[PDB]
Write an enzyme that holds these catalytic residues in place. Structure first.
Site, PDB file in Angstrom:
ATOM      1  N   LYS A  53       2.806  -1.308   4.315  1.00 29.48           N
ATOM      2  CA  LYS A  53       1.893  -0.123   4.109  1.00 29.48           C
ATOM      3  C   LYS A  53       2.896   1.129   3.851  1.00 29.48           C
ATOM      4  CE  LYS A  53      -1.819  -2.090   4.758  1.00 29.48           C
ATOM      5  NZ  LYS A  53      -1.551  -2.524   3.258  1.00 29.48           N
ATOM      6  N   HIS A  84      -7.837 -12.420   4.200  1.00 28.68           N
ATOM      7  CA  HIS A  84      -7.692 -12.086   2.777  1.00 28.68           C
ATOM      8  C   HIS A  84      -6.670 -12.656   2.012  1.00 28.68           C
ATOM      9  CE1 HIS A  84     -10.021  -8.964   4.758  1.00 28.68           C
ATOM     10  NE2 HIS A  84      -9.191  -7.923   4.620  1.00 28.68           N
ATOM     11  N   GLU A 101       1.035  -1.358  -0.034  1.00 25.91           N
ATOM     12  CA  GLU A 101       0.115  -0.047   0.100  1.00 25.91           C
ATOM     13  C   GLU A 101       0.789   1.127   0.020  1.00 25.91           C
ATOM     14  OE1 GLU A 101      -3.618  -1.363   1.901  1.00 25.91           O
ATOM     15  OE2 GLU A 101      -4.070   0.930   2.254  1.00 25.91           O
ATOM     16  N   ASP A 117      -5.220  -8.643  10.394  1.00 30.27           N
ATOM     17  CA  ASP A 117      -6.345  -7.859   9.513  1.00 30.27           C
ATOM     18  C   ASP A 117      -6.075  -8.506   8.067  1.00 30.27           C
ATOM     19  OD1 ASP A 117      -8.185  -6.093   9.938  1.00 30.27           O
ATOM     20  OD2 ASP A 117      -6.558  -4.442  10.679  1.00 30.27           O
TER      21      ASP A 117
END
EC number: 1.1.1.49
Lengths: 451, 461, 345, 361
Positions: free
Chosen positions: D202, D114, D90, D109
Site C-alpha cells: 500500500k 482476491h 496501491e 484481506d
C-alpha cells in the site's frame, strides 16, 4: 571382385583370418564371379597367390597384374606398417583400374589421428571419388544395431520423449570378457579409445541422438549422423579430467581361469587404456543437458553390449502415502549376445494398506533372440557385401563422419596428454576401476547390471 | 470400530470365505473392538453358531436371531454385546423393514457405517428413491456402496500403472490415442439368475457400475493427492463429461444382443427366452461407442462391449495409440501398425505394449518389419503373494477409515443420467434387441459399430 | 568470387547445364546465387522469430497448426524488360526461388550452431520434403490465371499480341511430408494486377480441443499468428478475449490481435535496400543468404514436375479481370477443403 | 448474528436466498462459525459469499484467455514455465479504514481471497463444461495444492514490511504489515516445481495490479555470437485500472556487421480499454444482482474455498508468530521492505519492472 592382403602366408592370416572370406560365401549368400588377387611373404577356383615387396621400386612396374575386367572396380586393404602404404598404392595403377564405379572397400582402422586418417584419405581420393569409397564399420552391419531405425520411427511411442525433458540421461556400455583378441602390440598401436570408441560407439550414439529423416535414403541416413558428431560437446583438457576415466587390464580371475596383467602381458610398461568412460552431451537443441554415459573395456565380468535410456521422473508422486517412491523408467536394449528390449514400469503391489500404498518396479520384456528362432543368424559381412555390389550402399562410412569422429577423439586425448593422465588398474573380472563410480555417482547415476 | 452381519445362512457370504479361509485363518487383521457378529434365520446358539462358523473357519462369535416380518426378534440383537458397520444382502421387499428395525434399536447413527452390495437402482427415480429413504436415516459419510470390480488388484494397479509412470502421460490425451477399447467377456450363460437378470438386463448388470468405473480409470484426471475424496471427485467428472446418448445417436452408438441357443463347452446351450419360459426383449449382451468430451479426451472414441454366452471369458482394456506421423519406410514393404497397450484383468493378470521391429534379414527391396509385444505377467512375478479371491482391504478400510473402493451419490447420480438416457432413447426408437448364436461374440451388427470407422477387434489369434 | 543473377534457369536441364559448366571451373564454396528475397530484414527475422523464441515451437507441427498461408501480391506488371515471363512464366521466377525460400524458413528443423552448411542443409531437406504435384493432381490442387484489362490498363495479351500459354497467376496447396508436417497443406499464392500489395505469412493453429463456453454465443474463432514481410514488416497473433458486457445468454467473445510493428522500433536499424549487406558476405565470409547447388536441384525438380502434369492435361490459366483479387477459381481449391483465403476482414 | 432478526422473523426460507459481503473471518473458525450459524438456518445454495475482485470484468477474462486458446496450455506445465509473479500495488495511504485495516492484514484481506483466487485462476485445470460449481471445483484443488508455508520455510519464503509511518499514525504498539511478499508452490502434476511469486502493498509509489508469467528457457542456443543475448519469453497482464496485455518475443534488430548480430526483445501489445472504450465502463458490482434470483451463480466464493483459504492463512500465522516475526518499516514508497528483493534476486529471478523506466545508458 578382389581383396588384397600382403601378410596371408604370414602370421594371423595364415591360420584364422582367411576363412572369414571363404566361410561367408562358401555355403552362405551366393557368389560366382570374383578374382581374389592375393600377395604375401563357390569362388574356390578364384583364389590365387602372388608375391610383392615395397623395398625394390622397379618391382612395382614389373608386377603389371589385373584379374577381372577394368569395368569392375578395385577394392583392397593395405595392412602394412606406416610409410609402406605409399609405395604400393600405385600397383592398381599398373592394372589401371580406377574408371568404373569402384568398390574401394576399406574395413580398416584408418589411422591413429585425423591428420593420420586424412593423409590416407587425401591420397586415396585422387584415384577414387567419394562415390567409389565404401568404408565398412562392422557394427553397422549387425542386425541388432540396424533395428535402431525401425525402433524409434516405426513406432509412435518414443519420439515425444527424445528431448531433454523426456530423457534425464542415457547409458551405453560395450562389454568384452577377454583382452586376448591376438591384438597385443596392435592394441598398443591404437587402444580402446580409437579401437572401440572412435567409430563403433559414436555410430551407436548417432543412431540414438539423431533426428529422423523424411525417408530411408542412403545419403539421407548418413547426412543426419554427422550432425551429432558435429554437435558433440568437445572435451578439452579443462573438461577431460571431470568427464573421462581410463583403466587398464590387470591380473584377476576371469572366465574360470586366473589371468595376468596388461603390462606384464606386453612385457614392457604400457600406457594404453583397455577401458575408458566418458560423460558426453549433444547440443543439437533436442539433447542439451542430456548426459550420455559411455563405457567400454576388456577383461570385464560379462560380454554384453546394451543401451539403457533412463527417463526424467514424473512431476509429482500423487501416491505420496509414504509408499509413493517411483523408480525412473528405463528403456533397455541389449544387442549382444542376446537380442533384447525391455521397459520398466510401476504397478500396485497386491495387498491391503499399511498406512500407504506399496508398489514394485517391473519390466515389460521382449527378446528378439527367442521370438525369431527359426530365422537366420546372418553375419554382418554377408549383409554388408551385397551393398558393395549394389549401386548405392547404405552401411558404409563417409568422410564427414570419420572427420567429425576424430576431431572429438583428438581433442580428448591431448586434453589428458596435456593433463598427464595415466590409466588406473583393475582386476580382470571386476567391472573396472573404482573412479568410474564417482564419475556417475557425483551426478546421482548408477550403472545397470544384474541383481 | 464395530461391524454387524446379516444373512449368514445364504450361499453368497459363505462362498467367498471358503477359498480365502483355507489359505488364511491366520491373519486376524481386525482390531480388538470388532468381534464376529452373526445374524441369520437360524436356531444355532452363540456357541451353536461358533460350531457352524468353525467349518467356515469361537473367540469373537456372538449370534442371536431375527425374523423378517416380526420387528420383535429385533430386540434379540439389542440383547447382545455392544461397546459404548452393517451388511444387508436381501430382496427388495424386506429393505425398508430391515431399515425400520435399525432406527428402533438405535443401531442407526452418525457412528453407524453402511455397506450395500445388492443392486441399488434402475432409474434416477429408484437411485434417488432407494437412497433417499436410506439418506434421511444416513449420510454419505456412513454409506459405502460395494463395486465388485473396483476391488480387483489388477484394477488397483491402474492408478500405479497410469500415474506411477511417466511413459503413459505424454500420450494419454486426444492427440496421443486414436481410440480406447474395453471388453468384458463371459463364456457362461446366466445360471440360476434368470428372473433377476431379466429385470436388470445386461446394461444394468455390468455397464452401469463396473464398466463405467473402468472407463473413468483410463480417463480420470489425476487428483493432487490420493484420498478417496480427491480421487472420486475426478472420476465423477468423467461420468459428468460423458457425452449423452440421445435418440439421434442411440441407433448409431449402441448395439443390443440377446444370447441364442448354440453351444458352450462342446455341448449345446439353450436360448435365453427358452430358459425363462416367457417372451423377453431384455438384453443379455450390449455394445456401445462412447465419447468423453473434455479438453484432454474430445474426439477419442471409447468402445464398451460386455457379453453373455460370448466365446471366451476374459476382460481386456486395449488403448490404441496414434499412428506414426510419417512412414520413413515408404516406397512399399513397411506397414507400421499403431502402438497398442493391452492389459488383461481377467482371467490372467497381464500388461503388454506393441512395438514395431525390423524382421531379421536384409533391407533388400523396402524395409520389412513386424509388430511385436513387450509382455509382462503379473501373476508369476507375485508368486509368493496370494491368488484371485477378493473382498479384502475393504475390511481394513472399515476400522481404519474412508474407502476409495466404495461409491458416492454424485457418481451413481451421474451413472444413471447417462444410463437412463440410453434406455428411454431406444424406447422412443423401438429398438428390439438382436439375436446371436451363443459363442459368436454377439450379434454381427456390433462389428459395424467399430468397422465402419476403421476399428477392428483385438484377439491374440 | 563469382556471384550469379536472378535469371539462373528455366528448367532442370538449364540450371544443370549452366551450373555444371561453371562448376566445372568453380566450386560450390566459391559460387553465389542471388535471391533478392533472402536478404531482407523481415525475412531474416523469421529464423529469429522461430528459433530465438520458445513460444511457437511446442505447436510447430501437424498437431498445432491448421494451415499456413503465404501470399505475395503485386499491383504492377513487368514493364521495362518483359521477356523472362515470356521465357519462364510466373512460376519459375518468384516461386522457384524467392517464395520457396520463405517456405523453407518456416518448415525447417534447427541446426546445432549458426553456420552456412548446417543452416542450408536444413533448407535442402525441406525442398526434398516437398510433395511433388504431378499428372492429374495439378487441376484440383492448382489454379492458374491471367490479369485482364481493367484497373486504364489492358490485359497481358490485350497488350502483347501473340498467344501465350503461360500464367501470370498460380495457386498451390503444397505439402511438406516429414514427421513434423505430414498433413499440413501449404498454400502459396502470387500474381500481378491484384487489388492489394502485401506479402505475408499466416499460420492458423488448430482449435482448442474442447470448448467450455461453446453453448450459446460460443463462437470460438481460432488463433492465428500473423507475419507481414513485404512491404509491411508486421507480426501479430489473433487471440480470443471476453467481451466486456452484461450478458444473460451464454459466453460472449471477441477475436482480437496482439499487434507488433517492427519498423516503428527498427528506425535505428538504418533501414536500407536489401542488397547492401549481401556484398559483405561475398567480401568477408561464408554465404548464408545464397542458394546452393543442391538447393537448385530440389527446387527445379518440384518446379518442373508440375509442368509435366498440366501440359499433359493441356492446362490453361483462367482469366481474372484485373482487380478480381485473382481468378475466382482459386477460391474453391480451399472452399472444397473448407479453408478460405485469409484477409484482415 | 443479527441474522437472528430474519429467523426470528421467519425469513430464513426457501422462497429467498442470500449473498454475504461482511468481514466474515480472521481465522478458519470464525468464517465456519459464521458459516455454521448461517448454515444452521440455510444451506450453501442459499448462502453466497461475494469477492469484489472476482466481479471485475477484466478479472473475468483470465479463464477465457487461458481456455479459449491453444497456444498457452501446451506450456502451462512445470516443463512449460519457470515461475509466476503476481503484483497488486496501491498508491493510497493505509488510511481508508486504518482502524479496520489493523487486525485483518493485507494477507487475509487481499491475498486470502482476491489474489488467491488469482492463484486459483492460474493453477487450475479446465472443468468438464462451464457450470457454476465446475469453475469453483478446480479452484478448490488449487487452494488444496497450495504448499502450507512451513515455520521452517517462513524465513526464506516470506517477506513483510511497513509504511514508513504506520506506527506514527495508529498509536498503540503495532506489528502490522503495510506490505507482504510470499513465494507459493502448487504441488500437482501440472505445477509441481514452479515458484509462485505473490507481492502486494500500500505504501508503494505505483498503482497497477499485474500478473507476469515467464516461460522457461530454450534448450540450445544455435546463434552463439557476441551481442546476441536471449531474455526468456514472458506473458504480462494488466487489468486494473489499465487493461494492457503483451507478450515478450525475441526479434532480430537489423544491422550490418555492427556489434555482431542484433536481436531485440519487443512486445505484441493489446489494450482492451481502447478497443472497448465505446462499451460499458461499468462498476465491478453490476451483474451479480441478476444471478441470485431463480438461479445457480458461478461468481461466489464457497465455504470450502474460504475454509481452504483460511487453513492456508492460519498455517502461516501460527508459524510466523512462532518465528516471532515483526514487520519492517519502509520509508513511504520504496516498493516494499528491502528484503523482498532478495526473495528473488538470490534465486536469479529479479522483480519484473517495465523496461522503459528500468534502464540507464
Amino acid at each position: 571382385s578382389t581383396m588384397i592382403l600382403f601378410g596371408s602366408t604370414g602370421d594371423l592370416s595364415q591360420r584364422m583370418l582367411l576363412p572369414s572370406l571363404y566361410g561367408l560365401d562358401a555355403d552362405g549368400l551366393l557368389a560366382d564371379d570374383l578374382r581374389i588377387v592375393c600377395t604375401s611373404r563357390k569362388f574356390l577356383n578364384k583364389l590365387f597367390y602372388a608375391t610383392v615387396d615395397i623395398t625394390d621400386p622397379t618391382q612395382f612396374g614389373k608386377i603389371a597384374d589385373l584379374c577381372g575386367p577394368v569395368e569392375k572396380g578395385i577394392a583392397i586393404y593395405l595392412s602394412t606398417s606406416p610409410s609402406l602404404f605409399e609405395g604400393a598404392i600405385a600397383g592398381l595403377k599398373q592394372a589401371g583400374l580406377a574408371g568404373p564405379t569402384s568398390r574401394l572397400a576399406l574395413e580398416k582402422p584408418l589411422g591413429q589421428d585425423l591428420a593420420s586418417s586424412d593423409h590416407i584419405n587425401d591420397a586415396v581420393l585422387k584415384v577414387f571419388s567419394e562415390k567409389q569409397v565404401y568404408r565398412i564399420d562392422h557394427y553397422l552391419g549387425k542386425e541388432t544395431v540396424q533395428n535402431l531405425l525401425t525402433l524409434r520411427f516405426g513406432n509412435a511411442l518414443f519420439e515425444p520423449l527424445w528431448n531433454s525433458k523426456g530423457i534425464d540421461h542415457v547409458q551405453i556400455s560395450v562389454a568384452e570378457t577377454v583382452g586376448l583378441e591376438g591384438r597385443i602390440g596392435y592394441f598398443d598401436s591404437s587402444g580402446s579409445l580409437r579401437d572401440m570408441v572412435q567409430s563403433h560407439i559414436l555410430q551407436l550414439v548417432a543412431l540414438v541422438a539423431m533426428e529422423p529423416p523424411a525417408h530411408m535414403e542412403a545419403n539421407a541416413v548418413r547426412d543426419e549422423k554427422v550432425k551429432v558428431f558435429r554437435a558433440l560437446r568437445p572435451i578439452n583438457n579443462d573438461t577431460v579430467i571431470t568427464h573421462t576415466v581410463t583403466g587398464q587390464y590387470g591380473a584377476g580371475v576371469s572366465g574360470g581361469k586366473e589371468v595376468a596383467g596388461y603390462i606384464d602381458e606386453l612385457g614392457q610398461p604400457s600406457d594404453t587404456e583397455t577401458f575408458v568412460a566418458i560423460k558426453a552431451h549433444v547440443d543439437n537443441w533436442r539433447w542439451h543437458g542430456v548426459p550420455f554415459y559411455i563405457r567400454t573395456g576388456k577383461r570385464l565380468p560379462a560380454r554384453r553390449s546394451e543401451i539403457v535410456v533412463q527417463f526424467k521422473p514424473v512431476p509429482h508422486s500423487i501416491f505420496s502415502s509414504s509408499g509413493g517412491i517411483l523408480q525412473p523408467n528405463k528403456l533397455r536394449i541389449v544387442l549382444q549376445p542376446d537380442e533384447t528390449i525391455q521397459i520398466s514400469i510401476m504397478v500396485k503391489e497386491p495387498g491391503l494398506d499399511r498406512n500407504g500404498a506399496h508398489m514394485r518396479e517391473v519390466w515389460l520384456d521382449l527378446s528378439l533372440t527367442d521370438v525369431f528362432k527359426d530365422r537366420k543368424r546372418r553375419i554382418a559381412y554377408e549383409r554388408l557385401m551385397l551393398d558393395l555390389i549394389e549401386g548405392d550402399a547404405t552401411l558404409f562410412v563417409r568422410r564427414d563422419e570419420v572427420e567429425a569422429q576424430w576431431i572429438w577423439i583428438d581433442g580428448i586425448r591431448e586434453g589428458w596428454k596435456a593433463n598427464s593422465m595415466k590409466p588406473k588398474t583393475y582386476v580382470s573380472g571386476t567391472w573396472g576401476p573404482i573412479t568410474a563410480i564417482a564419475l556417475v555417482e557425483r551426478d546421482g547415476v548408477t550403472w545397470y547390471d544384474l541383481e
